[PDB]
């Protein structure tokens, strides 16, 4: 419809652009991804692993990615400035494992041969914001240890490690567990803390799964034992609480069908999270989201990038 | 002249409106295209590629399109409800490549700047039936494989891929060949078949050009090799044979000069094609055409859209 | 089978309860109709005619009605909040004709005698939403004339009359045509227009059947000859289009087997109608339905009222 | 081409092209000039087309093919060639219109071969002219339409 | 914005924003990346900010304004392309402390733009980082303080 008219009739305001990260707000970059182009990226459900991906669909500044060789039911949407995709050849050049297309073996796969065989184009390098050409985030090296909140069970703070570093971000892994609970973040993430934070703050520390003598867990001896060093305390940066207020309006991807982006409202707030409500729909669809999540955007984002906006119901 | 009088003297009938697709029959839409307006569209001779086009001429519900920067000899006619044209900015928003006007480079071209420089108007979005704002055709995703009849050499069924998806239609590409033989269709096209159709039916499958060991072609291993999946069999829909009968009269664009539309007759029929004869002219001009071709229309179409009708000779 | 799991699997959304009329959505009313109860109602195929009906089956908030004296092949289903059914005694108190059980004469039927002969019970009055006690549709009186779309032949707009008024609705009857074309509506119906509408729009007006001089049908003369008034223009109200969107999911009664209610999707939209598709079935079974039709319902309606739901397939 | 008898009905049989569907098949009798015994191409010095997708076509061998398909050759003696016909150029007759088989027209012999005649419809373009077998059921002597109760289209 | 040359001193000139506070004025040279000829905004499709308190702010027009003001445009030929600087991220240098300009500190290039660098003071919070034009008089090569006799503040 139009935002201008909607804000008059609702007597409301939009969340100002300044409240968002530059990456959530930027509309002036062209989407250079094209149908059929090949690339590499993380599997969202297994964020430690990399796969060969094909551009299946483009919609404004977003794209839908397909896992080569696998079912179309695993297809997923990202923004064109996603740091979780990389150009062909990136795995080899940066020390990452490639999970190759269904039916191949890790070391049977060659990009050269694959491209000859498919007659496909690799998405050009200059499309990617993340190619490991930038010096890492300060003080977070692979193997280093920290304390991390299980985002799936937020009443737990757990023994964790850095297991991956790519440009300004790093992968938080929970020791002796699956990669299923892992997540990417930066040094200002409010979900991570230095070694010794639990004991100093009062809350208990969940030790690694199947660890000998769980209640008797000592950090300094775990470190010596695993030949690891703790991430240094000066590395953990303060991210201030966001400044979103209740009733501010914005645009948000619908989690029930991620092809769609809707008119939305801030229903509630925490220090680092906002509760999204889709205007005109039931509150039952309301969901909590991190303020720096890639799938929320300032009013106007859709119109300026060429993606349809679902009006309110 | 008049149809009414002609049908009396010839003791014949017109092909009823119900025999045509809604899109071949519809006369009540206004042609909103105007001279000089700019847009994007496919090159008919290279149906995988998109170019900047200018409205050169309008005649009723038809328009003649010019390739900006290029010779006027490549100009071509489409109907105003053509799905093969799109609004300015569509390439960027949907993952398609723009071949820019003669002398430009792909990434040197900006619509903003081009319009400022030419002082032209972009044809408004609301004119276009196809803008990729509709969810695709069921089960046909880019990269997926199928069997397709070479319409230029109909005694061949060949290994093919989907390489483009736009609203309800998709582009059939023959593997390891030029785009010259490609063609647009929908899931009910009688020219396409699932993987394994040749072997099940008896006819031989032409494998990709310059493929290693042509006579020794295995689908399931080609698929694994190319990290592709076959279009699923449930996706291929039955289009019934058309119901045109010999001697039914209609209106048809003259292929020898597409500015012209003539009184015509069904001379012969197949399941999915009719043979057109221009009344009053030699049978030597008779030509086979698909029943769902955009350039055939029910009697009256010209009169109701404002295009001249050539009477019989 | 659950809705929740299916919606997640399909990245699909159900039509919200808010899009439906209260009467289509209401699940918390009890069905007080019991087997063998007797009542009065319209024949759905001849909606101007009233019969003695018996409850043959109850399924959730729905009931199957049987025409007393006639074959069970004519049984039909309604909802318990149907305004097309009435308590025993209604026809006599409201000026409606009874078509009596097969083999009776109209003057010969008495409810008290019939109940005694059958030893049956009359459905209690409190079950019925329509007893002709509520305020009539403003401006629409029995005998007044109007222009109406033939919903069986929707290219035609025709000379019509109000022949029945029951609570907030009225019956549209096509002058001198079979009563099978009659339909119930309200002042906001998009299918009715004031006398003169066709003339004002430049549309052909279908005169009454067997009109003595069909060439020169004239409204002024016809009204005078028939001792009839036109429904005044002020009575006709604009009904806003519905807000259903393509691909929203819902529940719909199966037209071919009306005992059953199926998982359904909105395949297409018009201003006042939706095209229904039954998930998993051929698109050849798809059908258009008015958005206010009593036999479409929000997801969850069956489970909440106690009616089985047919899963997709 | 390599062929087989796939049907027999009274004095006629159906000739089938091995490994094709039946769209190229045709019915005939022992006197047909279009059929020859196994080995005929070899004896006459002409190229034999093997079945559509016979594994190694250049090396096709009838004795091997017969063995493997469990089939025998139609005996050489069963092929009883019909003599050439005696229709002469310009002779007139009646013939079914091939473009519109409901109609029968006045026609002339434009040209002859041993077993075929070229039909020309009198008064029409020579571009409609067509070759037809002399035994084809859709050519008839002058007067056939009149004696059978069928309309004859006169020339022009 | 609409601007005027109001001062010329040696190889530089002063840019003044018509009818705005003089606090917005700045000195530059012909190669400055911040100035453009009259008409530049129009050619680029950018909004042009008119003078403050302009009598009819809706329809500001350059031709009329020049005529009304008895003024000429700086000719397009005078405007020169200045090449981007060649500083790279993480290179180290010396920079005057903006908050305490008596002091010069050990510094690093935190980020780059074509004509500007973002300065970070080694050991201090990134919250004190600031953007500076690459030609600014208060950034200097390593060794500048020791060679000129100014104390250098070490990192921290």
SS3 track for chain B: CCHHHHHHHHCCCECCHHHCCHHHHCCCCCCCCCCCCEEEEEECCEEEEEEEEEEEEEECCEEEEEECCCCHHHCEEEECCCCCEECCCHHHHHCCCEECCCCCCHHHCCHHHHHHHHCCCECCHHHCCCCCCCCCCCCCCCCCEEEEECCCCCCCEEEEEEEEEECCEEEEEECCCCHHHCEEECCCCCCEECCCHHHHHCCCEECCCCCCCCCCCCHHHHHHHCCCCECCHHHCCCCCCCCCCCCCEEEEECCCCCCCEEEEEEEEECCCEEEEEECCCCHHHCEEEECCCCCEECCCHHHHHCCCCECCC
Under DSSP, the state recorded for A213 is S
Q: List the structure tokens of E110.
A: 């935190």
Rg (C-alpha) for chain A, rounded Å, is 21
Of C89, C115, C133, which marks where a domain is finished? C133
Question: C211 with C281, same domain?
Answer: no
Residue E148 CA: distances (Å) to CA of C310, E104, E136, E140? 89, 12, 18, 11
Last residue of one domain, picked from the residues B83, B117, B133: B133
Instruction: Out of E35, E53, E84, pick the residue that ends a domain.
Output: E84
**Cα(B33)–Cα(B39) distance, integer angstroms:** 10
Residues B97 and B192 in one domain: no
Q: How far apart are alpha carbons C270 and A74 in whole angstroms?
A: 33
For residues C236 and C143, state if they share a domain: yes
| C143, two tokens | 């005998």
In chain C, positions 7-36, which contact chain A (CB-CB < 8 Å)?
Answer: 7-8, 11-13, 16, 18-19
Inform me whether the C-beta atom of residue E45 falls under 8 Å from chain B C-beta atoms. yes
- Selection from B273, B263, B269 nearest residue B246 by Cα: B269
**How is residue B231 written in tokens?**
């279009």
Burial A265-286 (b: 16+ CB within 10 A, else e): bbbebeeebbbbbbbebeeeee
Degrees (nearest 5) of the Cα angle C140, C146, C147?
A: 140
Q: Which of D21, D53, D127 lies closest to B204 in CB terms?
A: D53
Burial of B228 (0-12, 13-18, 19+ CB in 10 A): buried
Residue B49 sits at the chain A interface (C-beta within 8 Å): no
E139 touches E93 (CB < 8 A) = yes
- Distance CA(B57)–CA(E129), nearest Å, equals 60
User: Nearest Cα to C140, choosing from C148, C149, C150?
Assistant: C148
Contact B281, B270 (CB under 8 A): no
- State the Cα–Cα distance between residues A224 and A208, nearest whole angstrom: 15
**Domain co-membership, A272 together with A237:** no
Measure in Å the smallest separation between the Cα of E47 and chain B Cα atoms: 14
- Among the partner-chain residues A254, A259, A313, the one whose CB lies closest to the CB of C243 is A313
Q: How many CB atoms lie within 10 A of CB D81?
A: 13
- Cβ–Cβ under 8 Å, residues A205 and A216: no
Q: Which residue of A has its CA nearest to B227?
A: A69
Q: Does B2 touch chain E (CB under 8 A)?
A: no
Which residue in the set B93, B141, B143 is minimally distant from A60, CB to CB?
Answer: B93
Cα→Cα distances E89→B162, B186, D37, E108, E113, Å: 45, 53, 89, 8, 10
Radius of gyration of chain B (CA): 21
Gapped junctions in chain B, after residues (C–N > 2.5 Å):
none
The dihedral sign for the CA sequence B68, B71, B74, B75 = positive
* 8 Å CB contact between A158 and A148: yes
Q: How many CB atoms lie within 10 A of CB B85?
A: 25
Q: Same domain for E99 and E73?
A: no
Which residues in chain D are closer than 8 Å to B202, comparing Cβ atoms? 21
Closest CA to E75 of E37, E40, E46, E112: E37
Closest partner residue to B142 (CB to CB) among A36, A101, A103 is A36
Judgement on whether residues C39 and C54 belong to the same structural domain of the protein: yes
Domain span holding position B300: 1-29+242-313
Give CA–CA dist B228/B143, Å, rounded.
Answer: 6
Continuous segment of H or E residues that includes residue C221? helix C219-226
Contact C20/C52 with Cβ under 8 angstroms? no
**Same structural domain, A159 and A207:** yes
In chain C, which residue's Cα lies nearest the Cα of A74?
C9
φ, ψ of residue A274 in degrees (nearest 5)? -125, 155
In this structure, the answer to whether residues B47 and B23 fall within a common structural domain is no
Burial class (CB in 10 A: 0-12, 13-18, 19+), E12: middle
Distance CA A307, CA B133 (A): 9
> What are the respective helix, strand and coil percentages of chain A, to the nearest 5?
20, 30, 50
Residue A69 touches partner B, C-beta closer than 8 Å:
yes
| E43 and chain B in contact, CB less than 8 A | yes
Instruction: Show which of residues 74-103 on chain B sit within 8 Å of chain A, judged by CB atoms.
Output: 89, 92-97
Return d(Cα A132, Cα A167) in angstroms, integer: 5
Under a CB-based contact definition with an 8 Å cutoff, are residues B287 and B255 in contact? Answer: yes
If you measure CA to CA, which chain B residue comes closest to E43?
Answer: B116
User: Tokens 């500083």 correspond to what residue?
Assistant: E87
Tell me the C-alpha distance between E87 and E107, whole Å. Answer: 13
Query: Residue D112 and residue D119: Cα distance in Å, rounded?
Result: 9
Is C129 found in the same domain as C67? yes
Interacting residues of E155 by C-beta distance below 8 A, sequence separation 6+: E105, E106, E121, E122, E123, E124
CB contact under 8 A, A35 and B141: no
Q: Are strands A205-206 and A157-166 parallel, antiparallel or unpaired?
A: parallel
A66 - beta bridge partners?
Answer: A54
**C-beta atoms of A34 and B165 within 8 A:** no
CA distances from B73 to B53, B69, B76, E92 (A): 14, 12, 9, 62
Q: How many angstroms separate the CA atoms of A289 and A255, rounded?
A: 11
Q: What's the sign of the alpha-carbon dihedral B166, B168, B172, B178?
A: negative
Give how far the C-alpha of residue A237 lies from the chain's centroid of Cα atoms, to the nearest Å. 19
Sorted by sequence, the CB contacts under 8 Å of residue C123 that are 6+ apart come out as: C33, C34, C37, C38, C39, C55, C87, C88
Structure tokens that stand for D131 in this block: 């070759």
Residue for token pair 């009540």: B28
Q: Residues E77, E7: one domain?
A: yes
Token digits of residue E134:
């690459």
Cα separation, E54 vs E64, whole angstroms = 12
Q: From E45, which residue of chain B is nearest by alpha-carbon distance?
A: B116
* Chain B (110-169) residues lying within 8 Å, Cβ to Cβ, of chain A: 132-133, 141-143, 163-165
Give the separation between CA C275 and CA C269, rounded to whole angstroms.
6
Strand partners, D139: D95
Q: Is the separation of the CB atoms in A165 and A235 below 8 Å? A: no
Question: Are A121 and A39 within 8 A, CB to CB?
Answer: no
Q: What domain count does chain E have? A: 2
A140: which strand partners?
none
| A76: enclosing H helix or E strand | strand A76-79
C137: tokens are 């549709």
- Inter-chain CB pairs, A–B, below 8 Å: 69
The reply to whether B203 and B264 lie within a common domain is: no
Q: What is the DSSP string of C243-278?
A: ---TT-EEEEE-SSSTT-EEEEEEEEE-SSEEEEEE
Mutate to test the interface with C, among A76, A257, A285 (most CBs of C within 10 A): A257
Alpha-carbon distance of B250 to B298, in angstroms, equals: 5
Nearest to C222 by CA among C177, C150, C159, C178: C159
d(CA B140, CA B232): 8
CB atoms within 10 A of CB B126: 8
Which CA distances in Å does E44 have to A79, B108, B111? 28, 15, 12
Distance from CA of B116 to the nearest CA of E (A): 8
Helix (H) or strand (E) run with residue E120 in it: strand E116-121
| Chains B and A are touching, with contact defined as 3 or more CB–CB pairs separated by less than 8 Å | yes
**D126 Cβ contact partners less than 8 Å away, ≥ 6 residues apart:** D110, D120
Across the B:E interface, residue pairs with CB atoms under 8 Å apart total: 4
Run of H or E including C65: strand C62-67
Three-state secondary structure call for residue E139? strand
Q: What span, in angstroms and rounded, lies between the C-alpha atoms of C293 and C23?
A: 10
β-pairing, C38-43 with C85-86?
Answer: antiparallel
Nearest CA distance, D30 vs chain B (angstrom): 31
Which residue from A257, A281, A282 is facing C11, i.e. has the nearest CB? Answer: A257
Same domain, residue pair E13 and E63: yes
Beta strands in D46-114 (DSSP E): 92-96, 104-112
CA distance C113 to C136: 32
At residue D43, φ and ψ (nearest 5 deg) are -65, -25
Q: What is the dihedral of CA B255, B256, B262, B268, to 10 degrees?
A: -60
Residue D53 sits at the chain B interface (C-beta within 8 Å): yes
Residues sharing a CB contact under 8 Å with residue A111, sequence separation 6 or more, in sequence order: A88, A89, A122
Contacts of D53 in chain B (CB under 8 A): 204
Q: Which residues on E lie below 8 Å from B112 (Cβ)? A: 45
Best probe of the B interface among A28, A30, A36, A310, by most B CBs < 10 A, is A36
* Residues with Cβ within 8 Å of residue C82, at least 6 apart in sequence: C41, C129, C130, C294
> Is the Cβ–Cβ distance between A98 and A51 less than 8 Å?
yes
Chain B residues in contact with E43 (beta carbon < 8 A) = 116
Nearest alpha carbon to residue B84 among B102, B105, B63: B63
Q: Are strands D130-133 and C145-149 parallel, antiparallel or unpaired?
A: unpaired
Residues of A in contact with B176 (CB under 8 A): 119
Q: Using CA atoms, how far apart are residues A289 and A272, in angstroms rounded to an integer?
A: 9
CA–CA gap between residue B181 and residue B174 (Å, rounded): 7
Neighbors of chain D with 3 or more C-beta pairs under 8 Å: B
Q: Indicate which CATH number applies to the domain containing E118.
A: 2.30.30.140
């Amino acid at each position: 419809w139009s935002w201008e008219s909607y804000l008059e009739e609702q007597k409301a305001i939009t969340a100002p652009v300044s409240l968002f990260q530059d990456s959530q707000a930027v509309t002036h970059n062209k989407n250079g991804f094209k149908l059929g182009m090949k690339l590499e990226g993380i599997d969202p459900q297994h964020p430690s692993m990399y796969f060969i991906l094909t551009v299946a669909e483009v919609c404004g500044y977003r794209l839908r990615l397909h896992f080569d060789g696998y079912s179309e039911c695993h297809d997923f949407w990202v923004n064109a400035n996603s740091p979780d995709i990389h150009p062909a050849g990136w795995f080899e050049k940066t020390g990452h494992k490639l999970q190759p297309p269904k039916g191949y073996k890790e070391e049977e796969f060659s990009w050269s041969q694959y491209l000859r065989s498919t007659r496909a184009q690799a998405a050009p390098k200059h499309l990617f914001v993340s190619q490991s050409h930038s010096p890492p985030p300060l003080g977070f090296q692979v193997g280093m240890k920290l304390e991390a909140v299980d985002r799936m069970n937020p009443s737990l703070v757990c023994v964790a490690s850095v297991t991956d570093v790519v440009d300004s971000r790093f992968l938080v892994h929970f020791d002796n567990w699956d990669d299923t609970y892992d997540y990417w973040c930066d040094p200002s993430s409010p979900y991570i803390h230095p070694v010794g934070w639990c004991q100093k703050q009062g809350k208990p520390l969940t030790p690694p799964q199947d660890y000998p003598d769980p209640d008797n867990f000592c950090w300094e001896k775990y470190l010596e034992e695993t030949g690891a060093s703790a991430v240094p305390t000066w590395a953990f940066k303060v991210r201030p609480p966001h400044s979103f207020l209740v009733n501010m309006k914005l645009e948000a991807v619908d989690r029930r069908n991620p092809a769609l982006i809707r008119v939305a409202s801030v229903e509630d707030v925490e220090d680092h999270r906002i509760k999204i409500h889709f205007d005109g729909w039931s509150h039952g669809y309301d969901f909590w989201i991190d303020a720096d999540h890639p799938d929320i955007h300032p009013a106007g984002w859709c119109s300026k990038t060429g993606h349809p906006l679902q009006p309110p119901l």
